Amino acid sequence: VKGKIAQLHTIMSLPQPYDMDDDSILVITRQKIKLNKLDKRQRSIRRLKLILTEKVNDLGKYTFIRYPEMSKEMFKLYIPGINSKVTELLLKADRTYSQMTDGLRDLWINVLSKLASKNDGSNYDLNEEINNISKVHTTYKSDKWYNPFKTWFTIKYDMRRLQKARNEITFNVGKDYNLLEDQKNFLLIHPELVLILDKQNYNGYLITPELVLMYCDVVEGRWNISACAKLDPKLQSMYQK
Amino acid sequence: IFKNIQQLYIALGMNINPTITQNIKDQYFKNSNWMQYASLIPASVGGFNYMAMSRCFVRNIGDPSVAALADIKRFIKANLLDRSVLYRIMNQEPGESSFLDWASDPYSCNLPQSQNITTMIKNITARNVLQDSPNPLLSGLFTN
Amino acid sequence: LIRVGINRGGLTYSLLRKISNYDLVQYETLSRTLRLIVSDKIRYEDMCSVDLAIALRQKMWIHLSGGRMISGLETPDPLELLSGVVITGSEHCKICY
């Protein structure tokens, strides 16, 4: 819903990118702000503007981008400094899988020799699909949509952890956000929003958790489609297409 | 198999569930050939494998236990597993299910604490939520 | 479930502890099974999968069934059952021979 994102832009004082057929929710939110009747969640969202102005100095020169236009720059989001926790796990998975390729190939060769046993040679050793077993981990690891997947999975994990921690214990009202600053990207994760600042080109993105989940699963789907098309001999051209 | 291994690692190391202890994590990560065993052993006998290779050809396999044990034999014949793995699977410990639980799912072996999440939710709803209700149907059906 | 329970009443943590501990219990059970000490007195890899399943179901349900039998369940799996022979080049089927 465009209304939710427009409301997030209009709660904390930021420029309004969107235009809408009926800006009723924006008028309602502005009226609530003027008379100071904001809810608890809206107040918690609004209080982050002070932190944003304290950390980021030249916040007034950033330009925020709407949802459809930012997709080109958000399907490939690489933040190398924050995905140092899932990389180790994926590397260990690669190692523990590489320890089984020989046995897996022998198993499939035995099964195929039992099911269709020709009496005149025709060994199954030189089969393309069987020979591509030994490079599944290599193909996933050296993929184009791997780093954006890692970054988005880390972002989703942090946001979901914060959201779950809010439910169990709301006592720690003071600090619920997660802040990560770098010479490239400035990332703020809140159980209700994600704010990304690109400082080299002065761009800003403010997204809802729904957009977080959408981008995460879309990038995961792209990664899986591309890699699994690369492996299969019948879909090698479909990979590049 | 590879995606199942990745899922196992992610769930055991990078999940928001706070009930996972460090003991389980550093027992599965440090012990030799434990994640491979967990990902390869068919789950009908205790593992985390939900794809019998017979499913790749036919849809209705039959009772999953027979397919699981056939796949275990195939694994140990292809040097993926060991004979001791099959011996341990044969000599594991039984659960504590009853006759009604057996009737609710006949193909199941007596795996300890094998009840599904949906089964637990259904049991909780039947025994707690729908006990005292004004609806004639539920009042007649769900007694104490 | 939580919404209906708070609407009606009767939900307590003692009932919902299992739902939270399910995954840890699964991991603990597998860990307990994986570090068991076994002997090679009986070779279980030389039996057909049907016999293995029969023995497993006999062993697991020993408290309910006892010495009695369980029937009507086991069916042979395809891959263990079938054996295909592609007859080509004027040679008889080895099994048929």
Side-chain angles (χ1 to χ4, degrees), chain B residues 27-28 54 63 66 70 73 87-88 91 94 107-108 110 113 115 132, chain C residues 8 22 26-27 31 36 45 47 49 57 59-61 63 77-78:
Chain B
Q27 212 181 11
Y28 276 75
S54 176
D63 68 317
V66 167
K73 275 173 59 172
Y87 296 168
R88 291 159 176 166
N91 292 116
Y107 282 148
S108 83
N110 188 18
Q113 287 76 63
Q115 293 222 310
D132 303 355
Chain C
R8 308 271 315 168
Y22 178 64
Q26 303 294 320
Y27 283 122
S31 163
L36 197 145
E45 77 265 352
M47 312 179 166
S49 84
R57 260 148 184 161
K59 277 172 155 276
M60 301 305 258
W61 299 101
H63 66 288
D77 52 320

PDB file of all heavy atoms in Angstrom, chain B residues 27-28 54 63 66 70 73 87-88 91 94 107-108 110 113 115 132, chain C residues 8 22 26-27 31 36 45 47 49 57 59-61 63 77-78:
ATOM      1  N   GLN B  27      27.886 -28.664  19.602  1.00  0.00           N
ATOM      2  CA  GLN B  27      27.919 -30.117  19.508  1.00  0.00           C
ATOM      3  C   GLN B  27      27.741 -30.588  18.075  1.00  0.00           C
ATOM      4  O   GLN B  27      28.412 -31.532  17.645  1.00  0.00           O
ATOM      5  CB  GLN B  27      26.830 -30.728  20.390  1.00  0.00           C
ATOM      6  CG  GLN B  27      27.191 -32.074  20.980  1.00  0.00           C
ATOM      7  CD  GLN B  27      26.074 -32.651  21.822  1.00  0.00           C
ATOM      8  OE1 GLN B  27      24.949 -32.154  21.804  1.00  0.00           O
ATOM      9  NE2 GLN B  27      26.379 -33.704  22.568  1.00  0.00           N
ATOM     10  N   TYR B  28      26.843 -29.950  17.323  1.00  0.00           N
ATOM     11  CA  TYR B  28      26.659 -30.326  15.927  1.00  0.00           C
ATOM     12  C   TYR B  28      27.767 -29.785  15.030  1.00  0.00           C
ATOM     13  O   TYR B  28      28.135 -30.444  14.052  1.00  0.00           O
ATOM     14  CB  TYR B  28      25.296 -29.852  15.425  1.00  0.00           C
ATOM     15  CG  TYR B  28      24.166 -30.798  15.758  1.00  0.00           C
ATOM     16  CD1 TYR B  28      23.662 -30.881  17.046  1.00  0.00           C
ATOM     17  CD2 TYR B  28      23.607 -31.613  14.784  1.00  0.00           C
ATOM     18  CE1 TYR B  28      22.632 -31.746  17.355  1.00  0.00           C
ATOM     19  CE2 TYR B  28      22.577 -32.481  15.085  1.00  0.00           C
ATOM     20  CZ  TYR B  28      22.094 -32.542  16.371  1.00  0.00           C
ATOM     21  OH  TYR B  28      21.068 -33.403  16.680  1.00  0.00           O
ATOM     22  N   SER B  54      13.187 -42.294  -4.515  1.00  0.00           N
ATOM     23  CA  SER B  54      12.124 -42.933  -5.279  1.00  0.00           C
ATOM     24  C   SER B  54      11.030 -41.949  -5.669  1.00  0.00           C
ATOM     25  O   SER B  54      10.316 -42.193  -6.645  1.00  0.00           O
ATOM     26  CB  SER B  54      11.528 -44.090  -4.478  1.00  0.00           C
ATOM     27  OG  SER B  54      10.432 -44.665  -5.163  1.00  0.00           O
ATOM     28  N   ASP B  63       4.392 -46.595   2.019  1.00  0.00           N
ATOM     29  CA  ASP B  63       4.709 -46.218   3.391  1.00  0.00           C
ATOM     30  C   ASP B  63       6.133 -45.675   3.453  1.00  0.00           C
ATOM     31  O   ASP B  63       7.062 -46.326   2.964  1.00  0.00           O
ATOM     32  CB  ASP B  63       4.530 -47.397   4.344  1.00  0.00           C
ATOM     33  CG  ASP B  63       5.536 -48.495   4.117  1.00  0.00           C
ATOM     34  OD1 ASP B  63       5.803 -48.824   2.943  1.00  0.00           O
ATOM     35  OD2 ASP B  63       6.057 -49.034   5.114  1.00  0.00           O
ATOM     36  N   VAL B  66       9.592 -47.839   4.612  1.00  0.00           N
ATOM     37  CA  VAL B  66      10.266 -48.782   3.722  1.00  0.00           C
ATOM     38  C   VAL B  66      11.198 -48.043   2.771  1.00  0.00           C
ATOM     39  O   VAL B  66      12.348 -48.446   2.558  1.00  0.00           O
ATOM     40  CB  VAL B  66       9.233 -49.628   2.959  1.00  0.00           C
ATOM     41  CG1 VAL B  66       9.893 -50.371   1.819  1.00  0.00           C
ATOM     42  CG2 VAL B  66       8.560 -50.607   3.902  1.00  0.00           C
ATOM     43  N   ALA B  70      15.270 -48.366   2.612  1.00  0.00           N
ATOM     44  CA  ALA B  70      15.917 -48.680   1.343  1.00  0.00           C
ATOM     45  C   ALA B  70      16.942 -47.617   0.976  1.00  0.00           C
ATOM     46  O   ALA B  70      18.037 -47.936   0.499  1.00  0.00           O
ATOM     47  CB  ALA B  70      14.872 -48.820   0.241  1.00  0.00           C
ATOM     48  N   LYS B  73      20.038 -48.139   3.064  1.00  0.00           N
ATOM     49  CA  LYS B  73      20.864 -49.198   2.487  1.00  0.00           C
ATOM     50  C   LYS B  73      21.620 -48.698   1.263  1.00  0.00           C
ATOM     51  O   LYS B  73      22.805 -49.007   1.081  1.00  0.00           O
ATOM     52  CB  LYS B  73      20.000 -50.404   2.125  1.00  0.00           C
ATOM     53  CG  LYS B  73      19.759 -51.358   3.276  1.00  0.00           C
ATOM     54  CD  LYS B  73      18.761 -52.433   2.895  1.00  0.00           C
ATOM     55  CE  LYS B  73      19.247 -53.233   1.703  1.00  0.00           C
ATOM     56  NZ  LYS B  73      18.370 -54.402   1.436  1.00  0.00           N
ATOM     57  N   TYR B  87      22.963 -49.413  12.241  1.00  0.00           N
ATOM     58  CA  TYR B  87      22.824 -50.125  13.508  1.00  0.00           C
ATOM     59  C   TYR B  87      22.241 -49.220  14.588  1.00  0.00           C
ATOM     60  O   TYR B  87      21.360 -49.636  15.351  1.00  0.00           O
ATOM     61  CB  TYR B  87      24.174 -50.690  13.951  1.00  0.00           C
ATOM     62  CG  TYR B  87      24.755 -51.737  13.023  1.00  0.00           C
ATOM     63  CD1 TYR B  87      26.069 -52.159  13.163  1.00  0.00           C
ATOM     64  CD2 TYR B  87      23.992 -52.300  12.010  1.00  0.00           C
ATOM     65  CE1 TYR B  87      26.605 -53.111  12.322  1.00  0.00           C
ATOM     66  CE2 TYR B  87      24.521 -53.251  11.164  1.00  0.00           C
ATOM     67  CZ  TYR B  87      25.827 -53.653  11.324  1.00  0.00           C
ATOM     68  OH  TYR B  87      26.357 -54.602  10.481  1.00  0.00           O
ATOM     69  N   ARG B  88      22.714 -47.973  14.662  1.00  0.00           N
ATOM     70  CA  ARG B  88      22.182 -47.027  15.638  1.00  0.00           C
ATOM     71  C   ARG B  88      20.719 -46.711  15.363  1.00  0.00           C
ATOM     72  O   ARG B  88      19.911 -46.623  16.295  1.00  0.00           O
ATOM     73  CB  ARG B  88      23.010 -45.745  15.631  1.00  0.00           C
ATOM     74  CG  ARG B  88      24.408 -45.910  16.181  1.00  0.00           C
ATOM     75  CD  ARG B  88      25.317 -44.805  15.683  1.00  0.00           C
ATOM     76  NE  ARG B  88      26.644 -44.892  16.275  1.00  0.00           N
ATOM     77  CZ  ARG B  88      27.704 -44.233  15.828  1.00  0.00           C
ATOM     78  NH1 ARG B  88      27.624 -43.425  14.785  1.00  0.00           N
ATOM     79  NH2 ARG B  88      28.872 -44.391  16.444  1.00  0.00           N
ATOM     80  N   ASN B  91      18.731 -49.466  16.622  1.00  0.00           N
ATOM     81  CA  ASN B  91      18.772 -49.593  18.078  1.00  0.00           C
ATOM     82  C   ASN B  91      18.601 -48.259  18.793  1.00  0.00           C
ATOM     83  O   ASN B  91      19.240 -48.021  19.822  1.00  0.00           O
ATOM     84  CB  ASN B  91      20.070 -50.265  18.509  1.00  0.00           C
ATOM     85  CG  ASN B  91      20.141 -51.716  18.087  1.00  0.00           C
ATOM     86  OD1 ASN B  91      20.993 -52.102  17.288  1.00  0.00           O
ATOM     87  ND2 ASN B  91      19.241 -52.531  18.622  1.00  0.00           N
ATOM     88  N   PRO B  94      12.557 -45.960  21.866  1.00  0.00           N
ATOM     89  CA  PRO B  94      11.162 -45.717  21.493  1.00  0.00           C
ATOM     90  C   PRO B  94      10.584 -44.501  22.201  1.00  0.00           C
ATOM     91  O   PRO B  94      11.119 -44.007  23.195  1.00  0.00           O
ATOM     92  CB  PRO B  94      10.441 -46.998  21.934  1.00  0.00           C
ATOM     93  CG  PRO B  94      11.519 -47.950  22.388  1.00  0.00           C
ATOM     94  CD  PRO B  94      12.691 -47.117  22.762  1.00  0.00           C
ATOM     95  N   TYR B 107       1.169 -44.886   9.716  1.00  0.00           N
ATOM     96  CA  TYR B 107       2.479 -45.125   9.125  1.00  0.00           C
ATOM     97  C   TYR B 107       3.630 -44.715  10.033  1.00  0.00           C
ATOM     98  O   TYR B 107       4.772 -45.101   9.766  1.00  0.00           O
ATOM     99  CB  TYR B 107       2.596 -44.380   7.794  1.00  0.00           C
ATOM    100  CG  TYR B 107       1.891 -45.057   6.642  1.00  0.00           C
ATOM    101  CD1 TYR B 107       1.324 -44.314   5.616  1.00  0.00           C
ATOM    102  CD2 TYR B 107       1.792 -46.438   6.580  1.00  0.00           C
ATOM    103  CE1 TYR B 107       0.680 -44.928   4.563  1.00  0.00           C
ATOM    104  CE2 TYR B 107       1.149 -47.061   5.531  1.00  0.00           C
ATOM    105  CZ  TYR B 107       0.596 -46.302   4.527  1.00  0.00           C
ATOM    106  OH  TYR B 107      -0.045 -46.922   3.480  1.00  0.00           O
ATOM    107  N   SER B 108       3.362 -43.954  11.089  1.00  0.00           N
ATOM    108  CA  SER B 108       4.432 -43.401  11.907  1.00  0.00           C
ATOM    109  C   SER B 108       5.055 -44.460  12.805  1.00  0.00           C
ATOM    110  O   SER B 108       4.363 -45.321  13.357  1.00  0.00           O
ATOM    111  CB  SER B 108       3.900 -42.254  12.765  1.00  0.00           C
ATOM    112  OG  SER B 108       3.286 -42.745  13.945  1.00  0.00           O
ATOM    113  N   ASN B 110       7.352 -45.009  16.392  1.00  0.00           N
ATOM    114  CA  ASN B 110       7.231 -44.420  17.723  1.00  0.00           C
ATOM    115  C   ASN B 110       8.417 -43.497  18.021  1.00  0.00           C
ATOM    116  O   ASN B 110       9.176 -43.685  18.971  1.00  0.00           O
ATOM    117  CB  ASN B 110       7.108 -45.521  18.766  1.00  0.00           C
ATOM    118  CG  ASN B 110       6.789 -44.986  20.139  1.00  0.00           C
ATOM    119  OD1 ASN B 110       6.337 -43.853  20.284  1.00  0.00           O
ATOM    120  ND2 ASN B 110       7.033 -45.795  21.160  1.00  0.00           N
ATOM    121  N   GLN B 113       8.564 -37.535  20.795  1.00  0.00           N
ATOM    122  CA  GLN B 113       8.231 -36.131  20.546  1.00  0.00           C
ATOM    123  C   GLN B 113       8.159 -35.827  19.051  1.00  0.00           C
ATOM    124  O   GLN B 113       8.716 -34.841  18.570  1.00  0.00           O
ATOM    125  CB  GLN B 113       9.225 -35.198  21.238  1.00  0.00           C
ATOM    126  CG  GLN B 113       9.076 -35.126  22.750  1.00  0.00           C
ATOM    127  CD  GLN B 113       9.644 -36.342  23.452  1.00  0.00           C
ATOM    128  OE1 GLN B 113      10.842 -36.611  23.378  1.00  0.00           O
ATOM    129  NE2 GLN B 113       8.784 -37.087  24.138  1.00  0.00           N
ATOM    130  N   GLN B 115       5.298 -35.288  17.371  1.00  0.00           N
ATOM    131  CA  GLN B 115       4.037 -34.645  17.023  1.00  0.00           C
ATOM    132  C   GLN B 115       4.276 -33.350  16.257  1.00  0.00           C
ATOM    133  O   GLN B 115       5.141 -32.548  16.612  1.00  0.00           O
ATOM    134  CB  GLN B 115       3.221 -34.366  18.283  1.00  0.00           C
ATOM    135  CG  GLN B 115       2.729 -35.614  18.988  1.00  0.00           C
ATOM    136  CD  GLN B 115       1.298 -35.483  19.463  1.00  0.00           C
ATOM    137  OE1 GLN B 115       0.936 -34.507  20.116  1.00  0.00           O
ATOM    138  NE2 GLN B 115       0.474 -36.470  19.134  1.00  0.00           N
ATOM    139  N   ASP B 132     -16.203 -25.104  26.699  1.00  0.00           N
ATOM    140  CA  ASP B 132     -17.483 -24.525  27.098  1.00  0.00           C
ATOM    141  C   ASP B 132     -17.855 -23.447  26.086  1.00  0.00           C
ATOM    142  O   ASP B 132     -17.325 -22.333  26.128  1.00  0.00           O
ATOM    143  CB  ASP B 132     -17.406 -23.959  28.513  1.00  0.00           C
ATOM    144  CG  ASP B 132     -16.981 -24.996  29.534  1.00  0.00           C
ATOM    145  OD1 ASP B 132     -16.831 -26.177  29.159  1.00  0.00           O
ATOM    146  OD2 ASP B 132     -16.798 -24.630  30.714  1.00  0.00           O
TER     147      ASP B 132
ATOM    148  N   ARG C   8     -11.331 -16.002  24.484  1.00  0.00           N
ATOM    149  CA  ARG C   8     -12.139 -16.925  25.273  1.00  0.00           C
ATOM    150  C   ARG C   8     -11.571 -17.194  26.659  1.00  0.00           C
ATOM    151  O   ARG C   8     -12.331 -17.276  27.628  1.00  0.00           O
ATOM    152  CB  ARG C   8     -12.301 -18.254  24.529  1.00  0.00           C
ATOM    153  CG  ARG C   8     -12.795 -18.112  23.099  1.00  0.00           C
ATOM    154  CD  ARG C   8     -14.312 -18.135  23.032  1.00  0.00           C
ATOM    155  NE  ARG C   8     -14.876 -19.197  23.856  1.00  0.00           N
ATOM    156  CZ  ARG C   8     -16.162 -19.306  24.159  1.00  0.00           C
ATOM    157  NH1 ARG C   8     -17.052 -18.429  23.721  1.00  0.00           N
ATOM    158  NH2 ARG C   8     -16.565 -20.317  24.922  1.00  0.00           N
ATOM    159  N   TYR C  22       9.762 -27.332  20.795  1.00  0.00           N
ATOM    160  CA  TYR C  22       9.702 -28.388  19.786  1.00  0.00           C
ATOM    161  C   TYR C  22      11.028 -28.561  19.051  1.00  0.00           C
ATOM    162  O   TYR C  22      11.559 -29.676  18.962  1.00  0.00           O
ATOM    163  CB  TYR C  22       8.578 -28.072  18.800  1.00  0.00           C
ATOM    164  CG  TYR C  22       8.429 -29.057  17.667  1.00  0.00           C
ATOM    165  CD1 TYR C  22       8.076 -30.375  17.910  1.00  0.00           C
ATOM    166  CD2 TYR C  22       8.628 -28.665  16.351  1.00  0.00           C
ATOM    167  CE1 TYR C  22       7.934 -31.276  16.876  1.00  0.00           C
ATOM    168  CE2 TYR C  22       8.487 -29.559  15.311  1.00  0.00           C
ATOM    169  CZ  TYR C  22       8.142 -30.863  15.578  1.00  0.00           C
ATOM    170  OH  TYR C  22       8.000 -31.757  14.544  1.00  0.00           O
ATOM    171  N   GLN C  26      13.693 -31.693  19.057  1.00  0.00           N
ATOM    172  CA  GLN C  26      14.073 -32.465  17.874  1.00  0.00           C
ATOM    173  C   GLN C  26      15.587 -32.602  17.775  1.00  0.00           C
ATOM    174  O   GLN C  26      16.120 -33.705  17.567  1.00  0.00           O
ATOM    175  CB  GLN C  26      13.523 -31.807  16.609  1.00  0.00           C
ATOM    176  CG  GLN C  26      12.028 -31.624  16.606  1.00  0.00           C
ATOM    177  CD  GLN C  26      11.291 -32.940  16.580  1.00  0.00           C
ATOM    178  OE1 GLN C  26      11.689 -33.868  15.883  1.00  0.00           O
ATOM    179  NE2 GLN C  26      10.208 -33.029  17.340  1.00  0.00           N
ATOM    180  N   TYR C  27      16.299 -31.482  17.920  1.00  0.00           N
ATOM    181  CA  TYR C  27      17.755 -31.526  17.829  1.00  0.00           C
ATOM    182  C   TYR C  27      18.352 -32.383  18.938  1.00  0.00           C
ATOM    183  O   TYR C  27      19.292 -33.151  18.700  1.00  0.00           O
ATOM    184  CB  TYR C  27      18.332 -30.113  17.866  1.00  0.00           C
ATOM    185  CG  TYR C  27      18.182 -29.368  16.562  1.00  0.00           C
ATOM    186  CD1 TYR C  27      17.503 -28.161  16.505  1.00  0.00           C
ATOM    187  CD2 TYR C  27      18.722 -29.870  15.389  1.00  0.00           C
ATOM    188  CE1 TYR C  27      17.366 -27.477  15.317  1.00  0.00           C
ATOM    189  CE2 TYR C  27      18.589 -29.192  14.196  1.00  0.00           C
ATOM    190  CZ  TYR C  27      17.909 -27.997  14.166  1.00  0.00           C
ATOM    191  OH  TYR C  27      17.771 -27.315  12.980  1.00  0.00           O
ATOM    192  N   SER C  31      20.583 -35.756  18.463  1.00  0.00           N
ATOM    193  CA  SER C  31      21.907 -35.827  19.073  1.00  0.00           C
ATOM    194  C   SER C  31      22.031 -37.039  19.985  1.00  0.00           C
ATOM    195  O   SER C  31      23.071 -37.703  20.008  1.00  0.00           O
ATOM    196  CB  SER C  31      22.197 -34.542  19.847  1.00  0.00           C
ATOM    197  OG  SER C  31      23.268 -34.731  20.754  1.00  0.00           O
ATOM    198  N   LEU C  36      25.103 -43.108  20.087  1.00  0.00           N
ATOM    199  CA  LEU C  36      24.796 -44.370  20.743  1.00  0.00           C
ATOM    200  C   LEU C  36      25.813 -45.429  20.330  1.00  0.00           C
ATOM    201  O   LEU C  36      26.339 -45.408  19.216  1.00  0.00           O
ATOM    202  CB  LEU C  36      23.377 -44.822  20.392  1.00  0.00           C
ATOM    203  CG  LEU C  36      22.700 -45.885  21.256  1.00  0.00           C
ATOM    204  CD1 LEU C  36      21.214 -45.603  21.350  1.00  0.00           C
ATOM    205  CD2 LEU C  36      22.929 -47.269  20.691  1.00  0.00           C
ATOM    206  N   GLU C  45      22.408 -54.712   7.079  1.00  0.00           N
ATOM    207  CA  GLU C  45      22.524 -54.238   5.708  1.00  0.00           C
ATOM    208  C   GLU C  45      22.343 -55.344   4.678  1.00  0.00           C
ATOM    209  O   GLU C  45      22.352 -55.060   3.477  1.00  0.00           O
ATOM    210  CB  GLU C  45      23.880 -53.556   5.497  1.00  0.00           C
ATOM    211  CG  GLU C  45      25.050 -54.512   5.352  1.00  0.00           C
ATOM    212  CD  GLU C  45      25.775 -54.748   6.661  1.00  0.00           C
ATOM    213  OE1 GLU C  45      25.466 -54.048   7.647  1.00  0.00           O
ATOM    214  OE2 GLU C  45      26.653 -55.634   6.704  1.00  0.00           O
ATOM    215  N   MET C  47      19.611 -57.407   4.719  1.00  0.00           N
ATOM    216  CA  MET C  47      18.191 -57.719   4.691  1.00  0.00           C
ATOM    217  C   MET C  47      17.468 -56.786   3.730  1.00  0.00           C
ATOM    218  O   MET C  47      17.911 -55.666   3.462  1.00  0.00           O
ATOM    219  CB  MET C  47      17.572 -57.605   6.088  1.00  0.00           C
ATOM    220  CG  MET C  47      18.359 -58.300   7.182  1.00  0.00           C
ATOM    221  SD  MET C  47      17.595 -58.098   8.802  1.00  0.00           S
ATOM    222  CE  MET C  47      18.470 -59.340   9.748  1.00  0.00           C
ATOM    223  N   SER C  49      14.593 -54.194   2.523  1.00  0.00           N
ATOM    224  CA  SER C  49      14.064 -53.036   3.237  1.00  0.00           C
ATOM    225  C   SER C  49      12.738 -53.345   3.922  1.00  0.00           C
ATOM    226  O   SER C  49      12.436 -52.767   4.971  1.00  0.00           O
ATOM    227  CB  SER C  49      13.907 -51.856   2.281  1.00  0.00           C
ATOM    228  OG  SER C  49      12.679 -51.926   1.583  1.00  0.00           O
ATOM    229  N   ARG C  57       9.486 -51.535  13.176  1.00  0.00           N
ATOM    230  CA  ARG C  57       8.168 -51.327  13.764  1.00  0.00           C
ATOM    231  C   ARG C  57       7.910 -52.284  14.917  1.00  0.00           C
ATOM    232  O   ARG C  57       7.195 -51.933  15.860  1.00  0.00           O
ATOM    233  CB  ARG C  57       7.084 -51.470  12.699  1.00  0.00           C
ATOM    234  CG  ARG C  57       6.573 -50.144  12.169  1.00  0.00           C
ATOM    235  CD  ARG C  57       6.157 -50.251  10.716  1.00  0.00           C
ATOM    236  NE  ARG C  57       5.762 -48.959  10.170  1.00  0.00           N
ATOM    237  CZ  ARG C  57       5.694 -48.681   8.876  1.00  0.00           C
ATOM    238  NH1 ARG C  57       5.986 -49.588   7.960  1.00  0.00           N
ATOM    239  NH2 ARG C  57       5.321 -47.464   8.492  1.00  0.00           N
ATOM    240  N   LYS C  59      10.283 -53.251  16.986  1.00  0.00           N
ATOM    241  CA  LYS C  59      11.094 -52.779  18.104  1.00  0.00           C
ATOM    242  C   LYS C  59      10.522 -51.509  18.726  1.00  0.00           C
ATOM    243  O   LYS C  59      10.507 -51.368  19.953  1.00  0.00           O
ATOM    244  CB  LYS C  59      12.533 -52.545  17.646  1.00  0.00           C
ATOM    245  CG  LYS C  59      13.393 -53.796  17.636  1.00  0.00           C
ATOM    246  CD  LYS C  59      14.743 -53.529  16.990  1.00  0.00           C
ATOM    247  CE  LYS C  59      15.792 -54.509  17.482  1.00  0.00           C
ATOM    248  NZ  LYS C  59      16.395 -54.069  18.770  1.00  0.00           N
ATOM    249  N   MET C  60      10.056 -50.568  17.899  1.00  0.00           N
ATOM    250  CA  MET C  60       9.611 -49.280  18.429  1.00  0.00           C
ATOM    251  C   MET C  60       8.346 -49.412  19.268  1.00  0.00           C
ATOM    252  O   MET C  60       8.233 -48.788  20.330  1.00  0.00           O
ATOM    253  CB  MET C  60       9.392 -48.283  17.291  1.00  0.00           C
ATOM    254  CG  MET C  60      10.620 -48.026  16.447  1.00  0.00           C
ATOM    255  SD  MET C  60      12.038 -47.503  17.424  1.00  0.00           S
ATOM    256  CE  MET C  60      12.030 -45.743  17.101  1.00  0.00           C
ATOM    257  N   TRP C  61       7.384 -50.220  18.819  1.00  0.00           N
ATOM    258  CA  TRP C  61       6.094 -50.342  19.487  1.00  0.00           C
ATOM    259  C   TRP C  61       6.054 -51.498  20.477  1.00  0.00           C
ATOM    260  O   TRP C  61       4.997 -52.113  20.657  1.00  0.00           O
ATOM    261  CB  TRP C  61       4.977 -50.499  18.456  1.00  0.00           C
ATOM    262  CG  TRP C  61       4.839 -49.351  17.510  1.00  0.00           C
ATOM    263  CD1 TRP C  61       5.299 -49.289  16.230  1.00  0.00           C
ATOM    264  CD2 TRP C  61       4.182 -48.105  17.761  1.00  0.00           C
ATOM    265  NE1 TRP C  61       4.976 -48.080  15.668  1.00  0.00           N
ATOM    266  CE2 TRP C  61       4.289 -47.334  16.589  1.00  0.00           C
ATOM    267  CE3 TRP C  61       3.518 -47.565  18.864  1.00  0.00           C
ATOM    268  CZ2 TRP C  61       3.757 -46.052  16.488  1.00  0.00           C
ATOM    269  CZ3 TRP C  61       2.989 -46.292  18.763  1.00  0.00           C
ATOM    270  CH2 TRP C  61       3.113 -45.550  17.584  1.00  0.00           C
ATOM    271  N   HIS C  63       6.148 -51.596  23.673  1.00  0.00           N
ATOM    272  CA  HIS C  63       5.353 -51.413  24.882  1.00  0.00           C
ATOM    273  C   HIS C  63       3.862 -51.579  24.606  1.00  0.00           C
ATOM    274  O   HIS C  63       3.128 -52.101  25.453  1.00  0.00           O
ATOM    275  CB  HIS C  63       5.642 -50.048  25.512  1.00  0.00           C
ATOM    276  CG  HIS C  63       5.210 -48.884  24.678  1.00  0.00           C
ATOM    277  ND1 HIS C  63       5.866 -48.506  23.527  1.00  0.00           N
ATOM    278  CD2 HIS C  63       4.199 -47.999  24.841  1.00  0.00           C
ATOM    279  CE1 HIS C  63       5.269 -47.448  23.010  1.00  0.00           C
ATOM    280  NE2 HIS C  63       4.255 -47.119  23.789  1.00  0.00           N
ATOM    281  N   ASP C  77       9.154 -50.848  -2.269  1.00  0.00           N
ATOM    282  CA  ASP C  77       9.448 -49.607  -2.967  1.00  0.00           C
ATOM    283  C   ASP C  77       9.831 -49.887  -4.419  1.00  0.00           C
ATOM    284  O   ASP C  77      10.321 -50.972  -4.740  1.00  0.00           O
ATOM    285  CB  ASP C  77      10.579 -48.863  -2.272  1.00  0.00           C
ATOM    286  CG  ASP C  77      11.788 -49.735  -2.046  1.00  0.00           C
ATOM    287  OD1 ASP C  77      11.609 -50.917  -1.690  1.00  0.00           O
ATOM    288  OD2 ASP C  77      12.917 -49.238  -2.231  1.00  0.00           O
ATOM    289  N   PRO C  78       9.611 -48.921  -5.320  1.00  0.00           N
ATOM    290  CA  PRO C  78       9.906 -49.154  -6.742  1.00  0.00           C
ATOM    291  C   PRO C  78      11.363 -49.482  -7.033  1.00  0.00           C
ATOM    292  O   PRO C  78      11.660 -50.531  -7.610  1.00  0.00           O
ATOM    293  CB  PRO C  78       9.498 -47.832  -7.407  1.00  0.00           C
ATOM    294  CG  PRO C  78       8.566 -47.186  -6.451  1.00  0.00           C
ATOM    295  CD  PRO C  78       9.007 -47.599  -5.089  1.00  0.00           C
TER     296      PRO C  78
END
